[PDB]
Amino acid sequence: GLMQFTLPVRLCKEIELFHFDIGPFENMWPGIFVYMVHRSCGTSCFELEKLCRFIMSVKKNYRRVPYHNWKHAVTVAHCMYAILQNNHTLFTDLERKGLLIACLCHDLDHRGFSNSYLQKFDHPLAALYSTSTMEQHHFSQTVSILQLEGHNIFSTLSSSEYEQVLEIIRKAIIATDLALYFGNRKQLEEMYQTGSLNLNNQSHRDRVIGLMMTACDLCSVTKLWPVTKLTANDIYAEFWAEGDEMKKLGIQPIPMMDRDKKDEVPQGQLGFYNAVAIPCYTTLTQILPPTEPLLKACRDNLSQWEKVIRGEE
């Protein structure tokens, strides 16, 4: 009960900043997460025995793929921690509990392949879940882990709080389907500008939580340049493996997934910052002003990709 987690001084300081990298020491990531729950939620939010046992079962059910791995899980949870800590009073006790778990579980049992590749391969998951295929699987895996003897970190919630938290987590995880981001941001953009945005409207909070999940999910673009650049290698290593597998099915992959077209990565990064990342953190900054540093970091990294094209690196 009186047992805190305490990080070394540099981590204790830097973990509070949006651009924090969780480092190459896998064995510290669970402690880093528990630290974030204790400071975000309280030392009372979960039983430490049950949380530790949930954390390690979640870790086990992430696979050894270049990008959609345990490191991604914890990185995306740290971004949500940063957003929550800079927006103290805007979020209920339940949302703070649900969203850090949502981020940890958001890519559970990812195989390194897009929804499109499951569909063209005719993977069983594509018959079971016709839209947001992997994302319904990720939530399904979250529910399974919560139901292992000793793993129900929500046991001490009422029947109705329990139903509310699983519903926060479900929507949170479904919203990490980037296919749903564009429509969600357009609606949030119209609501902010016409002045109709209302954070007491549950359907409005849902869209805002949705945008936060896209922001934490893309947070690789908001790091210091060297982290951003090295994480891009991992993102493309998966994409190019999927390109390879598309070709084995007799289908030319889109350029993004074709290793033959590596040359075009800088222009592809420009497109992505302009069409997806910058709009995302822009709308997020309007709704939640203290998240401006993510927009600032994203703009700095757009500038770094501009320099790559200009042959300056």
Ligand SMILES: Cc1nc(C)c(CCc2nc(-c3ccccc3)cn2C)nc1C
């Ligand atoms: C978080 C994240 N998510 C995505 C999806 C990407 C891919 C960025 C992209 N590259 C291309 C591209 C690349 C090479 C050749 C042709 C096209 C097209 N697009 C959209 N990058 C990051 C950092």
Ligand SMILES: [Mg+2]
């Ligand atoms: Mg995902």
Ligand SMILES: [Zn+2]
């Ligand atoms: Zn993800």
